[PDB]
Design a protein around this ligand. Structure first.
Ligand code: NA
Ligand code: NA
Length: 554
């Protein structure tokens, strides 16, 4: 009964995993860097307390259905005793060079009932022949090892990220490849299919794999999300984030992000494990937007996931269970006339979530829908409160969840406005999510939790919005866990065009160490799109830290 491209059985089961974990752990875990350069010393790999069973337990307790593990990241250090390199745990002090992290994690996923997956970085900064054909054969030999010796692999991840320069066996060169042709993916893809016929291939930047990136690391996919791409030709950013309405291939998007600002463990980020409200936001913008959530939990130098991350994951899984515990549509009278479905609760009913699912076994069909609630005898249009322009009511696909201000309503109407073919709605749901407040245990809410906060480097932090903003003040809170990167001087810029621009500040945080209270920066209202905070000397370290920041508006 189909309509446009349809997913394979593998792609259906993957989609139903809903959330699974990423785990990043490499030599740069020990150098406090997001990337390793390729000459990090394997002697660094010496955790005091490694336990892959803890990783699996933590992930399972956050509601993850599997784990994708960095068997090898960009620096090229291998987490399993490959036959093809010495740059691996064969030559680390951990278990006297006799350990295999891929094995222990595979076993632990098995023990905890989690699916297991591997990330094998195509870009390799250690290998002397990177960018030459000999590295391609090395890559495949290693991939053969991972898909032969560790049981069932649910996904294989080929990062598109490439920074050009690396140690490269001592050459210290910057090397350029043609990403469309260098890795020779088709021969590699055949091997994957042969060794692991149930495995889904994620790739970005070249030959289409079974899954696609969503074009950002922030943890969202488009409010419009077609699980389609075309098989051939270049993929624009817009196609990653929103998919392609008439794409000739089912290539569903995977929403990847970290539970911390960085992918790897950093001590200064222990205070910034994303809050419950931020993760719920990500949930609604991944699982709630026809995607899966790939949430990264990094391993600390001691070989364990940090307890902050663990506690937050549990609070997250708990809240998701609470929001969706009671489908209010279940007791209601539901009927469909034409393109209109009315859920009649029979009495005034309080809710703030709507959920629809298409039966995507038969493809993705809905292009546009409407939501109305009958409030005091009058129909009122609802919209997606998480979408800034438009009502956000376009595609549905695997699952679409719509948040809106809580209403007290006797009926809700769901209308399929536009569709490719006759829609097959497999499920409809209505729910009352509880208030997200700071005092929820382990929620970790901060004033900055849902600001788009990132750094450029350790003098400078930046904030930005989607729309343009009239900013009347800015506040800085020093770190309260430890004082390592406390900011003493500060200068603060605003901007409308990303060109850094205009200066608000010049100051000095007074007695900020012996008195870590909120610091307020005074300035005339600026219209701005971006803020820019400079650390002008850092009290005890090399990366500026903060407890929290607040941006006030008109
Ligand atoms: Na393919
Ligand atoms: Na909140």
């Amino acid at each position: 009964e189909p309509c446009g491209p349809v997913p394979t059985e593998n792609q259906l089961r993957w989609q139903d995993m809903e959330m699974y974990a990423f785990i990043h752990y490499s030599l740069n875990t020990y150098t406090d860097e997001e990337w390793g350069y390729g000459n990090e010393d394997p002697q660094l790999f010496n955790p005091s307390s490694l336990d892959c069973r803890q990783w699996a337990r933590v992930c399972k307790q956050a509601g993850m259905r599997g784990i994708i593990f960095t068997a090898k990241h960009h620096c090229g250090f291998c987490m399993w005793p490959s036959a093809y390199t010495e740059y691996s745990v064969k030559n680390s002090p951990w278990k006297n060079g006799k350990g295999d992290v891929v094995r222990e994690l595979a076993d632990a996923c098995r023990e905890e009932g989690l699916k297991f997956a591997v990330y094998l970085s195509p870009w390799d900064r250690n290998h002397p022949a990177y960018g030459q054909p000999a590295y391609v054969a090395y890559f495949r030999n290693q991939l053969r090892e991972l898909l032969t010796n560790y049981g069932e692999i649910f996904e294989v991840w080929f990062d598109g990220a490439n920074g050009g320069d690396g140690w490269y066996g001592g050459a210290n060169e910057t090397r350029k490849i043609d990403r469309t042709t260098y890795y020779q993916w088709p021969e590699t893809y055949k091997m994957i299919r042969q060794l692991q016929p149930n495995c889904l291939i994620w790739n970005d930047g070249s030959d289409r794999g079974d899954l696609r990136w969503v074009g950002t690391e922030a943890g969202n996919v488009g409010e419009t999300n077609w699980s389609l791409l075309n098989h051939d030709g270049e993929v624009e950013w817009h196609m990653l984030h929103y998919g392609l309405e008439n794409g000739d291939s089912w290539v569903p998007g995977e929403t990847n992000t970290s539970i911390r600002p960085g992918w790897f463990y950093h001590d200064t980020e222990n205070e910034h494990v994303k809050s419950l409200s931020k993760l719920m936001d990500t949930y609604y913008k991944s699982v709630g937007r026809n995607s899966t959530l790939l949430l990264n939990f990094p391993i600390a130098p001691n070989g364990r996931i940090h307890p902050n991350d663990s506690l937050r994951g549990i609070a997250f899984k708990k809240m998701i269970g609470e929001v969706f515990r009671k489908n209010l549509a279940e007791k209601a009278r539901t009927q469909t006339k034409g393109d209109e479905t009315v859920i009649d609760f029979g009495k005034p009913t309080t809710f703030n979530r709507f959920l629809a699912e298409e039966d995507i076994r038969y493809g993705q069909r809905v292009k546009k829908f409407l939501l109305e609630a009958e409030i005091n005898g009058q129909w009122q249009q609802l919209k997606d409160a998480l979408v800034e322009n438009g009502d956000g009511l376009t595609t549905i696909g695997h699952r679409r969840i719509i948040c809106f201000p809580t209403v007290n309503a006797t009926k809700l109407r769901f209308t399929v406005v536009n569709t490719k073919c006759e829609p097959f709605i497999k499920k409809l749901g209505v729910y009352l999510a509880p208030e997200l407040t700071a005092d929820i245990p382990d929620a970790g809410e901060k004033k900055s939790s849902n600001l788009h906060l990132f750094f450029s480097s350790p003098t400078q932090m930046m904030i930005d919005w989607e729309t343009e903003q009239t900013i009347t003040s800015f506040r800085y809170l020093p770190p309260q866990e430890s004082k390592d990167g406390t900011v003493t001087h500060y200068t603060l810029w605003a901007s409308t065009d990303w060109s850094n621009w205009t200066k608000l500040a010049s100051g000095e945080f007074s007695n900020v160490v012996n008195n870590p209270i909120w610091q307020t920066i005074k300035f005339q209202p600026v219209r701005a799109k971006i803020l820019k905070l400079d650390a002008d000397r850092l009290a005890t370290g090399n990366r500026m830290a903060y407890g929290d920041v607040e941006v006030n508006l008109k």
